[PDB]
Amino acid sequence: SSFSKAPQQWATFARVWYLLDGKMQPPGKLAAMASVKLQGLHKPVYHQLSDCGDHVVIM
């Protein structure tokens, strides 16, 4: 909570890597959550102009 400006900004806009198993899974439903994570629509700090984006690795 009581962080300095630079580390607080870094923590707020930090990138996250997610894992997704694709065995016996529908491509449309996998791509829905993949697109959500890529756009950052899972973050309350999301904005179109902001570069908020998370990496997704699908196996």
Partner 1 sequence: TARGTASRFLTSVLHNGLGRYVQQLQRLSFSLSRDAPSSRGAREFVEREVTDFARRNPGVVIYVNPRPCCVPRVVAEYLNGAVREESIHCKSVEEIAALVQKLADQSGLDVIRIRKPFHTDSPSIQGQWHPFTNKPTTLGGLRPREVQ
Partner 2 sequence: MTGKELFEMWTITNPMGLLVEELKKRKISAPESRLTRQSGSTTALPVYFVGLYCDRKLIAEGPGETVLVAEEEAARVALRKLFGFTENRRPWDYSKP
Partner 3 sequence: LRSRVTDRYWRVQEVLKHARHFRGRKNRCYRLAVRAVTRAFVKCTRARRLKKRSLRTLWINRITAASQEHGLKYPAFIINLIKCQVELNRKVLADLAIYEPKTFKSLAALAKRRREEGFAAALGDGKEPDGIFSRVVQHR
User: What residue 19 binds from partner 1, partner 2, partner 3, none (CB within 5 to 8 A, per partner kind)?
Assistant: partner 1
Write down the least CB distance from residue 14 to partner 2, Å: 4
Cα 50 versus chain centre, distance: 13
Does residue 49 bind partner 3 (CB under 8 A)? no
DSSP 11: H
Which residue of 6, 11, 24, 49 would you call a contact of partner 1, by CB under 8 A?
Answer: 11
Buried b / exposed e over 27-56, threshold 16 CB at 10 Å, is eeeeeeebeebeebeebeeeeeeeebebeb
Binding site for partner 2 (CB under 8 A): 1-4, 7-8, 10-11, 14-17
